[PDB]
Design a protein around this ligand. Sequence first.
Ligand SMILES: C[C@](O)(COc1ccc(C#N)c2ccccc12)C(=O)Nc1ccc(C#N)c(C(F)(F)F)c1
Length: 238
Amino acid sequence: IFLNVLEAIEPGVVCAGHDNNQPDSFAALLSSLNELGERQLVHVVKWAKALPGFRNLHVDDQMAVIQYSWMGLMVFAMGWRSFTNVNSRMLYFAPDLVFNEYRMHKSRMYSQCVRMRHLSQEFGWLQITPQEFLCMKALLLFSIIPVDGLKNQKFFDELRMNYIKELDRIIACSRRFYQLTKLLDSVQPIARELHQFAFDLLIKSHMVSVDFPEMMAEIISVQVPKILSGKVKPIYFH
Ligand SMILES: C[C@](O)(COc1ccc(C#N)c2ccccc12)C(=O)Nc1ccc(C#N)c(C(F)(F)F)c1
C-alpha cells in the first residue's frame, strides 16, 4: 500500500525549457536552472500534499518543511535520474538540461556538481532499488526543521517515525539500514553548498545578468538564510 502510493504520486519528467542550440553561457545556464527549479517546486508541493499522513501536519508546518527540504529533494531526485538515465556520466537536471563537465564549469557550480555526481554513482554502487529510492526521498521531506521546533512538533515527529518504519519494512537488514541512512545523511552537506550558492547568487543577481523566479527569490531570502544561519538544521542519523 505505502509503495503503491509513492509510485502513484511520483512526478513525471519536468523540463527546463533551455535553448540547447545556443552556445553555453553562465547567464543562460543559470536562468534555466532557476526556471527549472521554479517549475519543479510546483510539482514538489502537489507531491508532498499527496503523501500519506502529510495533511496531519499543521498547515504552516507543511509549507515550511516543503521549502526547507526542497533543495535536498531535488539533489536526491537528480542524482537518481543521472544514475538511471546516463549511468552517472552526466548530471541529468532535466531532459533538456544535461550537464557535462564543461557546463559544470561554466555554471560556476563545479564543486557542487561533482559532489552530486558522486551521489549519483552511489545509487549504482549500493544498488539502490527504485522502491528504496522512493521511500528515502519521502523521508528527506521530513529531515530538516527549525531548532526552535515546528508549530506542531508532535505530529511531525510521529510522521517522520512512520516513514522510517516504512524504510525498515522495504529493507526487511541492519547493514542495509546503515548504508541507506549514511547515504541520506550525505545529501544534506550537498544541499547546503547549493543553498549557499543560491543565496550568494541572488544577492548579486543584479550584477551577473541572472533572473530569479518569484517563489525561488522569496524562499532564498526568507527560508534559506534560516538554514545558513543555523536556525533551521537537518536531522542526521549519524
Ligand atoms: C542555481 C539554482 O537555479 C538555484 O535554484 C534553487 C535555489 C534555491 C532553492 C532552495 N531552497 C532551490 C531548491 C530546489 C531546486 C533549486 C533551488 C539551482 O541550483 N537550480 C537547480 C535546479 C534543478 C535542480 C534539480 N534537480 C537542482 C539540483 F537540485 F541541484 F539538482 C538545482
